[PDB]
Design a binder for this molecule. Structure first.
Ligand SMILES: [Zn+2]
Ligand SMILES: [Zn+2]
Lengths: 198, 198
DNA sequence: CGGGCATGCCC
DNA sequence: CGGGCATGCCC
């Protein structure tokens, strides 16, 4: 069986989808999202809010999992990891080899798959508070996309899966990520490239 | 006492000096030397011939030591090391944390100073073969100057000391090193910069 | 802050 | 091979 996890969108019977906050114009904004590219541009080790939207209420015990995969076919089979440098100078529960962290959640779990060796981070699904339409999770990416010996400039996808306590896949979505020093610059560059030569 | 080793030229009573081979014009020549800058430009993990010249014969048991130091005052006190990435994917006698290796010598010693924590690599001094005016040692630099988490774009000096078996300093010389992908390009850039704004 | 250097890599 | 993109950093 494949050790490459699915990246195929599956909004499912609960109508699961992701949302992202709008950002300012700054060259080095901390986080910004491109709907045209389905791609988040963000700085390393800084908050990256991702909203979870559903049309129907998931059952009690539903979990929210995040996992990085390399986008390009030629790299899909390689596990996405922290580079050796940031792993060694790493700063609570997260193993230093994990790229993706969740902040501000008391029930975060970090998993190293016994068979596929892939990393993921899981929190309980909470329904939106009354008067809210979505649930926000604060992700952190602990390397730049360019990190030598880690992502090494290879674009990644973040796969968000909604899973019941039994392990059934309820929903899956994904978005591309570039972790970089200047998210505003690089977003504009890539959207201009899309228009000019895409 | 200082943990910063001397970089002061001391040609000494044996008239000790370094020599360097001339190189071609290629953008990515493997090794090239600038007399104006006293600076070697070379590729990582590739041979970097350094000639030892003396006017008088050193005594039996003389040793040749090489050691890297950061050139800029603000970094002199930090030990020059291999970056975490190249340390982890490191390929005989050299500890993977050492930047500088010697190839082709059966009597190489690698030393980690017990008190200053500085790395060095030592070989016996051999007199030039008859019909030769110098002795060539093949050094290898195992990171680029730009390596994240190692030299991190900070220029280094290589200090070559001639030492008798008793530990007396007989001679000291040094040269600046930039380990980079394109030594020919970067040499020309830096010599042009010297002329234009030095 | 935004203009522009930096430098291994471009597949 | 040499022209030029790349992208964290410029002190
Ligand atoms: Zn990293
Ligand atoms: Zn390195």
């Amino acid at each position: 069986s494949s050790s490459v996890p699915s990246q195929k969108t599956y909004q499912g019977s609960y109508g699961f989808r992701l949302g992202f906050l709008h950002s300012g114009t700054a060259k080095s904004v901390t986080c910004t999202y491109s709907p045209a590219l389905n791609k988040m541009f963000c700085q390393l080790a800084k908050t990256c809010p991702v909203q979870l939207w559903v049309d129907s209420t998931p059952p009690p015990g539903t979990r929210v999992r995040a996992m990085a995969i390399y986008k390009q076919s030629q790299h899909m089979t390689e596990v996405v990891r922290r580079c050796p440098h940031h792993e060694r100078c790493s700063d609570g529960l997260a193993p230093p080899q994990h790229l993706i962290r969740v902040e501000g959640n008391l029930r975060v779990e970090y998993l190293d798959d016994r068979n596929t060796f892939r990393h993921s981070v899981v929190v309980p699904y909470e329904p939106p508070e009354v008067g809210s339409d979505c649930t926000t999770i604060h992700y952190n990416y602990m390397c730049n996309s360019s990190c030598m010996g880690g992502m090494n400039r290879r674009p990644i996808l973040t796969i968000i899966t909604l899973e019941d306590s039994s392990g059934n896949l309820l929903g899956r979505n994904s978005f591309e990520v570039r972790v970089c020093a200047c998210p505003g610059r690089d977003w504009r560059t890539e959207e201009e490239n899309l228009r000019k030569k895409g």
